[PDB]
Nucleic acid binder design. Structure first.
Lengths: 108, 411, 423, 80, 98, 94, 76, 78
DNA sequence: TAATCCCCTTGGCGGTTAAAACGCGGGGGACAGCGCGTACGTGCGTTTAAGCGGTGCTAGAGCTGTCTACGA
DNA sequence: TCGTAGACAGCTCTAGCACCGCTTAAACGCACGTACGCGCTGTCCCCCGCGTTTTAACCGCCAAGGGGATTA
């Protein structure tokens, strides 16, 4: 064929939209699917994951360290608001726990 | 002069609402027959000290120490009994009415046989220590435990007091009255009525909770029924005893001796009675040295103490094959055991209801599955008690067992 | 007293039959003390209750004593006499024990009805003068009856008279009122002249202090025209101007002696001093919540200091301690306070001249009063209200010296770089 | 063989302090063992059916994917 | 030395623990029971390592939220000591076992 | 080295546009690669049932964004609406 | 069966929609299902709290019972 | 508006819930919880109608709403 | 799609130190009991607005031509 | 690159939509007796705190094997 000017490059983004629609044609959820439907969700995911990584970099600044650890994630998401209610049933591998101490557990 | 007199109807107060007797008079003293038991008490002229006419009879005080509280007389018995008296005694009766002020401020005098309490030369009671059963003290608690010898009318049970500190004193001669082998002795008893960890040794006509703060007695008369019940996980066992009267702190009442055993209550015991004497008392059953499940090992002795049969948990397997279920009742959710003739509710409170005394039962329903069934039982005494939180399979087991007991289900 | 004479008998000869008895007209219980039927004045008796097992009941009767008449002052004329505390009778049911037990509580009612507590202010000099401040559509709260009383208010040379439609006169003196305040109907339900008294005056049924006069500006009917809101403006603005002229008339008689300060709704907040969040507002001398019933009127003059409660995370509603000067006056808790109005109420305290404190901590406040009513400087011996602040304690160590992580951390990092694509 | 008692009382206690509680009572131990292992069996039961659906002889971590899909209690990052 | 004040030891414990995440449970003392349980369902079922690792993660993950729920139940109960009552009650909220 | 089509590399770029130097655990890379699929599925099946409900065999981006409005709350949902919208209209411009 | 009366309920239910989207029409029939879903998330919403009150050993109720079980329901 | 939640209707629920002594602040407490439970089930229903591009709201909206809620009961053919 | 295999799982273990368990010393916290004041439930007057029988009222759900344009 | 699902009119018609009486059953509030929430308790008791024993779980190292991935 010609140069592989990507649909995602025509979206200006990273996710493999042709391979995403390939994945869409695996579960086969309707007889047809609009061409922007793989574009739209991939754009949504690339947006939200960037915010997740932005909060993870803030948690790394809180760590004052270099490599992102999985304990950061509850530091991100279990300190979040929309994701925290949104991913409440989600359990987090190597996430740790939030520091949550009761004032009744404190002396005079 | 005249030699006798007769009233076959007059009372004499003996520890509460004691009924009629039989006054007979004589020129030296009094022949008072009991019209109930035939008990004749006699008084002579060397005994007489005091008599005062109150609201009505010969309220006499003799040199027996006795307080002869004759009553059931009419007003001018004041004359006619004195018409038998007049020649000798050197004693008349005042119209006292020792006190009617209704004002608390007075002094207690420990009487030599009685207990007098005065409101400024005006007394209200002079009560012998025969009239009390047992006694504790406190600060400022002065506990006068009164146990009636079964009169169906009004019977006083307890009077406590505001006595001041009794500076350099206490309840001295108050605590100076009647004295109310250890056959076996127990160790580390998980007490639930009262709560704690105390022990009970076994005495010839009774038992005794020895403890650290309190110390209680268990008469053989006061028992009602051996109850033997488990916990539903069968890791524990409920050692409950039907009793009458309850024992008290003055504030609460212990109608049922509840104890907690485990399933692990397994040891040998050694009885402090001889090998012929264990069956001289027992009769062929309970030997000197047996062993095993202490929930059963102790209760075998407890049966021959009560001389009354065994309460056995039923074979009714409710939900998940359990012999009961819990239910929300009286600031608690506790189990309900079915029995041969009743139901028993552990734990706070313990409530037994016999089958025959039930007038009827009834249900009440929410809508959802989650224990919306609400089941109440009305007895034939007019009382009805309500036990919520029943599931649908719990209803199935319940309803089938109630129908197996052929009970009136109001619906 | 209970009795005086043997001929002062019971109403029935009971000990021939051993029946319970109360003498009502002499106000005494008569019970056999093991056959000794003794009377007892009800003013020496606490109370009574009942238990029953089977038919066998138990009627305890607690009697007044140190411990029952007090907690072990005396209006009781012997400190160290031996008394009684209680008795307990047992009978059965083959009954009247309960049936006389129910007669006991109204004897307690009738005695304290007979023995109540017994403010009579001066008879207000009514003067139908030239500047007679009179105004209409005025309702009073608390009312004379349970019904909402209607009338007018008439100010005089020594106070106010709420002359009702029935002609009932409500004499409200100058020296009686502590806090005469005015809240407009600005987005309100009423427009209120509150008159916080200093004396609970006997009128209607009770003795009242916080009495308010109001005119409703409500809206909800249960029976787009732009004349409904204009009629609402005619009923609000064109009548509140006459209400301000009535303020001018009552202060044509006081000449700002009995003032009417302006509400501070910029500092007013929906808080709960009466445990219901209504619009408090400061005024020139009063943080007042007279917008609804009952009106919270606190004297700002008798306030020692201010402790803010619950100054802590996840607490949008926090509380506050009005540490009073008069600790005999019970310390009230203004509650459910917004975090945005923290510093406004602080600046209000800067206008109230109070060096204040904050905190999250709480303690039994009546216990702190009993700590401080024994000595006004005795709680000040405890560091004062720096006891609200922390002071720490001794320990071994925090022991977080080796607070580190994986020294041999995982090598999970840059996965790769070799990649490709298709269509 | 008695491996229900493989979990130890101090490990239980370290879980409880990682659970952030204050005072121990020793009755909770077998209670937690029972609450644990039955829920584990709830996972293990349909987990076996997944490898049976794969017709294999070895349990993988693809199984717990669909197990937590039934649970709504999912973790992440465990496709390998 | 001086046995430590109540809670302060455990407060240092939980402060040490709230940062930490890794396994409080041994591998093969857990695996032994897991392989024991799996044979009760069916024989001839091998494991891989990593699934067991994820399950040893997941069981702790299930238990820990239960633990804090039980702790909040004690906060309701307003007593220092933990209670057997709550968990069932928590499951009465959670609808797990009836 | 495990050459399967988990994404793992667009993450390896979009961190570097917001944090150009921060190390990452590749563990968390797998966490997020799972996390992609975890939301892909709940988009996809509910899009399938919505395509069933109107009885319409096509799935365009309005059918996506209605499930987005369902599945994501608030302003970040509106942000994702904007960012998907500009991308879909960008490929409309292509 | 049915406890909530119809019209003051459903006028408030219609009052909700304008916060989301004004000027909309409705099934009268759908409102009854909303009543059912409401009273569904009333009774079991209360029973657990009554269980909290019996764990509070109280006859009366408190909002501590309310806020607890909803978190135990994972609602917050 | 929300003031229409009458205290005796609340007590009908509470005795249907089997609660006998009821604190008065629970009345105003539950009113917001009502609206919380409302708004989720109303928002997606609005979303359903807007996707269906209609002027009217169906009960099938409630059907598919409570499916996403995890709060699905039945009674009208669904 | 039947052979092929190498890329995974296993039986029991040499070492030995940090972790598991009983107990002694002692101490920390539930708890039922004592009041003691208190607020929601019952009886009841009062409002009074809501379910229903009836009005007039009109704008929205529904299916049929159509021909087509974006997915296949 | 052939194809058919559906947006654009269009008719049908009907499910509601907003009120006016009837009336009539349901909610508001006043007064009040009280069952139950609340503060102090005192008593016993049940885990810390190591102490000591132990002990067994994990690294380095061994072979044995086996069954699922991987190739036309």
């Amino acid at each position: 064929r010609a140069k592989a000017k990507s649909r995602s490059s025509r979206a200006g983004l990273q996710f493999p939209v042709g391979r995403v629609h390939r994945l869409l044609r695996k579960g086969n959820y309707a007889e047809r699917v609009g061409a922007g439907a793989p574009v739209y969700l991939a754009a949504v995911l690339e947006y939200l994951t960037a915010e997740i990584l932005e909060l993870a970099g803030n948690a790394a600044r809180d760590n004052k360290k270099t490599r992102i650890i999985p304990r950061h994630l509850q530091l991100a998401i279990r300190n979040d608001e929309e994701l925290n209610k949104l991913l409440g049933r989600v359990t987090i591998a190597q996430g740790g726990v939030l520091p949550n101490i009761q004032a009744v557990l404190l002396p005079k | 002069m005249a030699e006798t007199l007769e009233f076959n109807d007059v009372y004499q107060e003996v520890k509460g609402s004691m009924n009629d007797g039989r006054l007979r008079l004589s020129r030296q003293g009094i022949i008072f027959k009991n019209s109930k038991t035939g008990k004749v008490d006699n008084i002579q002229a060397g005994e007489l000290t005091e008599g005062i006419w109150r609201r009505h009879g010969l309220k006499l005080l003799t040199k027996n120490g006795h307080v002869y509280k004759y009553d059931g007389f009419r007003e001018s018995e004041f004359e006619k009994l004195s018409d038998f008296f007049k020649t000798h005694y050197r004693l008349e009766l005042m119209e006292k009415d020792l006190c009617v002020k209704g004002w608390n401020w007075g002094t207690v005098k420990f009487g030599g046989q009685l207990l007098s309490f005065d409101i400024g030369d005006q007394p209200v009671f002079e009560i012998p220590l025969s009239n009390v059963s047992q006694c504790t003290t406190g600060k400022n608690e002065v506990t006068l435990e009164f146990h009636q010898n079964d009169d169906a009318e009004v019977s006083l049970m307890e009077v406590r007091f505001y006595v001041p500190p009794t500076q350099x004193x206490x309840x001295x001669x108050x605590x100076x009255x009647x004295x109310x082998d250890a056959i076996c002795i127990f160790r580390e008893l998980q007490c639930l009525t009262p709560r704690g960890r105390y022990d009970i040794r076994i005495y010839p006509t009774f038992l005794h909770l020895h403890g650290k703060t309190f110390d209680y007695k268990i008469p053989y008369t006061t028992v009602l029924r051996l109850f033997l019940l488990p916990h539903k996980d069968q890791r524990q066992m409920f050692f409950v005893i039907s009793l009458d009267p309850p024992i008290k702190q003055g504030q609460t009442r212990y109608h049922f001796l509840i104890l907690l055993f485990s399933k692990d209550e397994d040891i040998s015991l050694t009885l402090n009675m001889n090998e012929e004497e264990v069956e001289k008392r027992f009769e062929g059953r309970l030997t000197k040295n047996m062993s095993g499940s202490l929930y059963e090992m102790v209760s075998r002795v407890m049966k021959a103490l009560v001389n009354r049969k065994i309460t056995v948990p039923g074979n009714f397997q409710g939900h998940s094959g359990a012999q009961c279920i819990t239910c929300s009742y009286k600031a608690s959710s506790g189990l309900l055991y079915p029995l041969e003739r009743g139901f028993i509710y552990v734990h706070k409170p313990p409530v037994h209801i016999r089958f025959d005394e039930i007038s009827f039962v009834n249900f009440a329903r929410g809508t959802t599955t989650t224990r919306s069934f609400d089941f109440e039982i009305e007895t034939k005494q007019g009382t009805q008690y309500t036990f919520s939180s029943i599931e649908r399979e719990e209803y199935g087991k319940l309803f089938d067992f109630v129908n197996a007991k052929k009970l009136n289900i109001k619906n | 007293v209970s009795y005086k004479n043997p001929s002062l008998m019971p109403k029935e000869p009971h000990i021939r039959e051993m029946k319970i008895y109360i003498d009502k007209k002499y106000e005494t219980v008569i019970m056999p003390v093991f056959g000794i039927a003794t009377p007892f004045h009800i003013a020496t008796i606490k109370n009574i209750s009942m238990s029953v097992e089977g038919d066998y009941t138990y009627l305890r009767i607690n009697f007044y004593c140190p411990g029952s008449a007090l907690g072990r002052g005396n209006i009781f004329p012997n400190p160290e006499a031996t008394f009684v505390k209680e008795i307990t009778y047992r009978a059965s049911n083959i009954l009247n024990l309960q049936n006389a037990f129910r007669i006991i509580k109204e004897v307690q009612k009738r005695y304290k009805x007979x023995x109540x507590x017994x403010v009579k202010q001066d008879s207000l000099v009514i003067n139908l003068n030239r500047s007679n401040p009179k105004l209409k559509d005025l309702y009073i709260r608390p009312n004379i009856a349970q019904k909402r009383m209607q009338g007018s208010l008439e100010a005089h040379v020594n106070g106010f008279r709420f002359t009702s439609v029935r002609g009932d006169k409500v004499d409200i003196l100058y020296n009686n009122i502590k806090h005469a305040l005015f809240q407009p109907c600005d987005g309100e339900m009423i427009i209120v002249l509150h008159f916080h008294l200093k004396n609970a005056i006997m009128f209607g049924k009770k003795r009242h202090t916080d009495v308010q006069f109001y005119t409703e500006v409500g809206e909800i009917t249960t029976d787009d025209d732009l004349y409904a809101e204009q009629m609402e403006r005619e009923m609000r603005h064109k009548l509140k101007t006459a209400f301000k002229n009535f303020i001018e008339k009552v202060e044509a008689l006081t000449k700002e002696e009995l003032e009417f300060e302006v509400p501070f709704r910029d500092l007013g907040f929906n808080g709960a001093p009466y445990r219901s969040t209504c619009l408090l507002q400061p005024t020139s001398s009063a943080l007042v919540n007279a917008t609804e019933w009952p009106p919270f009127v606190v004297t700002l003059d008798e306030v020692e200091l201010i402790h803010f409660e619950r100054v802590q995370f996840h607490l949008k509603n926090f509380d506050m301690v009005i540490v009073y000067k008069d600790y005999s006056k019970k310390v009230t808790m203004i509650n459910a306070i917004p975090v945005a109005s923290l510093d406004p109420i602080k600046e209000w305290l800067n206008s109230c001249d109070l060096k204040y404190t904050e905190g999250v901590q709480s303690l039994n406040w009546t216990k702190i009063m009993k700590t401080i009513v024994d000595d006004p400087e005795g709680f000040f011996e405890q560091g004062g209200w720096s006891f609200l602040x922390x002071x720490x304690x001794x320990x071994x160590x925090x022991x977080x010296x080796x607070x580190x992580x994986x020294x041999x951390x995982x090598x999970x990092x840059x996965x790769x770089x070799x990649x490709x694509x298709x269509x | 063989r008695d491996n229900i008692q493989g979990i130890t009382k101090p490990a239980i206690r370290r879980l409880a302090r990682r659970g952030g509680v204050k005072r121990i009572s020793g009755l909770i131990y077998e209670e937690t063992r029972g609450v644990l292992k039955v829920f584990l069996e709830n996972v293990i039961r349909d987990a076996v059916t997944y490898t049976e659906h794969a017709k294999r002889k070895t349990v993988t971590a693809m199984d717990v994917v669909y197990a937590l899909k039934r649970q709504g209690r999912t973790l992440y990052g465990f496709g390998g | 030395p001086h046995r430590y004040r109540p809670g302060t030891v455990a407060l240092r414990e939980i402060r040490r623990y709230q940062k930490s995440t890794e396994l409080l449970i041994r591998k093969l003392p857990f695996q032994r029971l897991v392989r024991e349980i799996a044979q009760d369902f069916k024989t001839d079922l091998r494991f891989q390592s990593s699934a067991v690792m994820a399950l040893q993660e997941a069981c702790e993950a299930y238990l820990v939220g239960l633990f804090e729920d039980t702790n909040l139940c004690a906060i309701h109960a307003k007593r220092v000591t933990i209670m057997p009552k709550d968990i069932q009650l928590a499951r009465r909220i959670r609808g797990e076992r009836a | 080295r495990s050459r399967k089509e988990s994404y793992s590399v667009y993450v390896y770029k979009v961190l570097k546009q917001v944090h150009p130097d921060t190390g990452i655990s590749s563990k968390a890379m797998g966490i997020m690669n799972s996390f992609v699929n975890d939301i892909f599925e709940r988009i996809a099946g509910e899009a399938s049932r919505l395509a069933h409900y109107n009885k319409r065999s096509t799935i365009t981006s309005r059918e996506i964004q209605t499930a987005v409005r369902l599945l994501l709350p608030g302003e970040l949902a509106k942000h994702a609406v904007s960012e998907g919208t500009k991308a879909v209209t960008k490929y409309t411009s292509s | 069966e049915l406890l909530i009366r119809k019209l003051p309920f459903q006028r408030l239910v219609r009052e909700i929609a304008q916060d989301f989207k004004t000027d909309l029409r409705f099934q009268s029939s759908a409102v009854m299902a909303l009543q059912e879903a409401c009273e569904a998330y009333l009774v079991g919403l209360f029973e657990d709290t009554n269980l909290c009150a019996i764990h509070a050993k109280r006859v009366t109720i408190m909002p501590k019972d309310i806020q607890l079980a909803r978190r135990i329901r994972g609602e917050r």
